[PDB]
Write a protein that binds this ligand. Structure first.
Ligand SMILES: CC(C)(COP(=O)(O)OP(=O)(O)OC[C@H]1O[C@@H](n2cnc3c(N)ncnc32)[C@H](O)[C@@H]1OP(=O)(O)O)[C@@H](O)C(=O)NCCC(=O)NCCS
Ligand SMILES: [Mg+2]
Length: 718
């Protein structure tokens, strides 16, 4: 479909004209005229920034190569990085001015959920994860141990159930305490004189803090639920003395509901596999339907978005809390182009520019509640939140800002409607973080330590230095501990408190929920106002940490400190005279090869961009591209310095591959790699990301995955 200078695929063109544009008050002929111009005016920069990356990698590649056996002189390294304009200066103190942002980003501290947007089922559950059942999260997972004769099964178990009930009672005791007595003793709740009254065997009692009573449902004389609030997050006690769980409870408590996933990132990036116009539109569709509010998915059940929740207030008025997680959308970074719309010469258009345009325009519908726009509003303050990933340095951030500003003109939106959540997940950003924050000083809504892509850039940036530590050891290196702290320092010194989120990384062990409750608390304790979780269940559980830690306080306590030097940030995580025994090296390669084949096989064959892949210790892991980035990069490093040979990788890939078939054997759609490995696009793709990983730009895995999936798809219609 010829438009100005463009060949827009009809699948996109139809979608954008019929589905997306009506109701936006944007003239379809003008919209596409804006598109043409933006793409034209801004493609040079996009390539210029991308070229600037490759150059810097080569210079840094040169530098390490012409230096061996005489350990890194860290002052020459730092001077080198300044000479080439990698390590740009540090700007003067400032305060972000970003306005028009929702309370749930500026003020509320709680879990943030990230879901693949190509999956309507998970997306719906994600936006609905704002509110989650604490009973289901504890009963369903290993938080309540299955031992001591308390196993779960197809029939509800009292023994497990009472452990669940008890846990939650401790929680309520710990968070919204009774004046006197414990929740585990309650016999019923009432509301007298606009105050919560909790009946006990010995007395009746209010709350230690009457201001933690938020409201209720049903008759005051005997409510159906009681609504509480601690650290700005809501807790609901569901009452039904005639329920499966109710009749077993001293107060007839049915369930405790926690306000969990406050915000959700609807993901077009590492979570998903979209390599052409079709895929692209398919996820653009889901984003539109979330923003309209009408998105539905069949399961005899239809899954829709939750409506807002009504309550009676203490004094007696009716009010409304939001039923839905406030959505961001993660666009893709500055790297990839896409089939979707091409040049006359056949050059593809940058995917990132197109996301900004189509994702921006669609999000319009999520700011209003009309007939054309659909019933549910997302940002009640009038903002569009876009997570911008994999940015390298301040200039690339400024580019996103400029891109956003042109996408605002084209959409007729007021300037700065499009807010940017900034990933801190590339070295060049990490060492120039203050500068990145300044470049988006009027747009930024968060920073987040994407430790995973960050680990990826650490291996690739420093590819020629020598052998790296095994990936399990990365978590305790100088560079990563400084980067976490450094992120929080910079955010806080930019006045992020009350204005924007300081975000931390994802929990990848989806089955170790007992671990996550125990371990992840460290993030809020480190001052993170939000952090990333892999599921609504996880979100409900992470919620617990924000009831315990007072994040706002921790931020106040941390203000002004400087817990990281630039030497700590540039400390390269090298092996440095650590000789792994024969077994270890065979473990790392084996480990990494399973994680790769596990993820890539479902990527290239099934078009699935996020998967549960069990490792060589059989811990289920949530793998995506960032995890693939580490895995492949590390193996490349070990190859570049001959810890392994090319042959070593093959043999491991070859023995790991049949195993991933065994764990995938129950799938209807799955086609296995063994025994004929060389006639398997999947296998060959995994093999490319290792044997040619040293040559991918900044270690990114998109070039190969996109090309290999494009390949597979053609060899599927043919
Ligand atoms: C990999 C994955 C398919 C594994 O699935 P699984 O846990 O083995 O199987 P299920 O999802 O059916 O587990 C049960 C429930 O978990 C929910 N779920 C799991 N991850 C979810 C996610 N992050 N968002 C919303 N719901 C999720 C499902 O909705 C499902 O309930 P349902 O019957 O109502 O659909 C899935 O968890 C996933 O895509 N990863 C999480 C997304 C993510 O965090 N990625 C970000 C990468 S940066
Ligand atoms: Mg990332």
């Amino acid at each position: 479909v010829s438009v100005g200078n463009l060949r827009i695929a009809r699948v996109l063109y139809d979608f954008v004209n019929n589905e997306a544009l009506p109701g936006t008050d944007i003239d379809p002929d003008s919209f596409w005229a804006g598109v043409d111009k933006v793409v034209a005016d801004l493609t040079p920069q996009n390539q210029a920034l991308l070229n600037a990356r490759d150059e810097l990698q080569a210079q840094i590649d040169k530098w390490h190569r012409r230096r061996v056996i005489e350990p890194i002189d860290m002052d020459a390294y730092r001077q080198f990085l300044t000479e080439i304009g990698y390590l740009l200066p540090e700007p003067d103190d400032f305060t972000i001015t970003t306005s028009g942002v929702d309370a749930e980003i500026t003020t509320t501290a709680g879990p943030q959920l990230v879901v693949p947007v190509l999956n309507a089922r998970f997306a719906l559950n994600a936006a609905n994860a704002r509110w989650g059942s604490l009973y289901d999260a504890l009963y369903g997972t290993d938080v309540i141990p299955e031992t001591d004769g308390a196993e779960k099964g197809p029939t509800y178990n009292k023994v497990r159930g009472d452990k669940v009930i008890a846990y939650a009672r401790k929680f309520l005791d710990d968070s919204v305490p009774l004046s006197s007595g414990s929740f585990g003793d309650a016999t019923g709740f009432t509301v007298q004189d606009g105050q919560l009254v909790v009946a006990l065997p010995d007395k009746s009692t209010g709350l230690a803090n009457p201001g933690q009573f938020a409201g209720y449902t049903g008759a005051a004389e005997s409510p159906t639920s009681v609504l509480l609030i601690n650290h700005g997050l809501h807790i609901e006690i569901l009452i039904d003395p005639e329920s499966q769980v109710g009749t077993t409870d001293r107060a007839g408590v049915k369930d405790v509901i926690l306000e969990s996933a406050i915000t959700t990132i609807m993901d077009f990036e590492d979570s998903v596999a979209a390599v052409d116009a079709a895929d692209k539109v398919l996820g653009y569709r889901n984003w539109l339907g979330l923003n309209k509010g009408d998105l539905a998915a069949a399961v005899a059940f239809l899954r829709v978005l939750n409506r807002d929740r009504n309550y009676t207030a203490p004094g007696g008025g009716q009010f409304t809390l939001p039923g839905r997680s406030l959505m961001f959308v993660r666009n893709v970074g500055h790297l990839m182009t896409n089939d979707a719309i091409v040049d006359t010469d056949g050059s593809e258009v940058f995917e990132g520019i197109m996301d900004a345009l189509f994702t921006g325009l669609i999000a319009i519908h999520g700011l209003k509640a009309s007939d054309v726009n659909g019933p549910l509003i997302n940002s009640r303050t009038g903002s569009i939140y876009i997570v911008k990933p994999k940015m390298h340095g301040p200039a690339e951030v400024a580019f996103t800002c400029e891109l956003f500003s042109r996408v605002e003109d084209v959409l007729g939106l007021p300037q700065n409607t499009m807010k940017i959540g900034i990933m801190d997940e590339e070295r060049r950003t990490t060492v120039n973080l203050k500068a990145c924050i300044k470049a988006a000083a009027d747009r930024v809504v968060f920073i987040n330590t994407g430790f995973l892509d960050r680990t990826g850039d650490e291996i690739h940036t420093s590819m020629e230095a020598g052998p790296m530590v095994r990936k399990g050891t990365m978590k305790s290196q100088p560079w990563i501990l400084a980067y976490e702290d450094h992120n929080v320092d910079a955010g806080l010194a930019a006045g992020f408190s009350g204005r924007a989120q300081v975000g931390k990384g994802m929990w990848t062990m989806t089955e170790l929920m007992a671990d996550m409750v125990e371990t992840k608390i460290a993030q809020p304790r480190a001052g993170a106002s939000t952090a990333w979780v892999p599921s609504p269940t996880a979100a409900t559980l992470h919620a617990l940490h924000y009831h315990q830690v007072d994040v706002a306080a921790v931020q106040q306590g941390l203000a002004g400190k400087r817990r990281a030097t630039i030497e700590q940030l540039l400390t390269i995580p090298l092996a440095k005279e650590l000789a792994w025994a024969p077994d270890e090296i065979r473990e790392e390669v084996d480990n990494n090869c399973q994680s790769i084949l596990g993820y890539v096989v479902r990527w290239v064959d099934q078009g699935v961009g996020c998967s549960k892949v069990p490792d060589i210790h059989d811990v289920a892991l949530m793998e995506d591209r960032a995890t693939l980035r580490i895995s492949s990069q590390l193996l490349a490093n070990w190859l570049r310095h001959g810890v392994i040979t090319s042959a070593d990788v093959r043999a491991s890939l070859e023995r790991m591959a049949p195993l991933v078939d065994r764990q995938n054997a129950g799938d209807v759609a799955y086609r296995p790699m063994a025994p004929n490995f060389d006639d398997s696009i999947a296998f060959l793709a995994a093999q490319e990301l290792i044997l040619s990983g040293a040559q991918q730009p900044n270690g990114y895995t998109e070039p190969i995955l996109h090309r290999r999936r494009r390949e597979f798809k053609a060899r599927a219609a043919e």
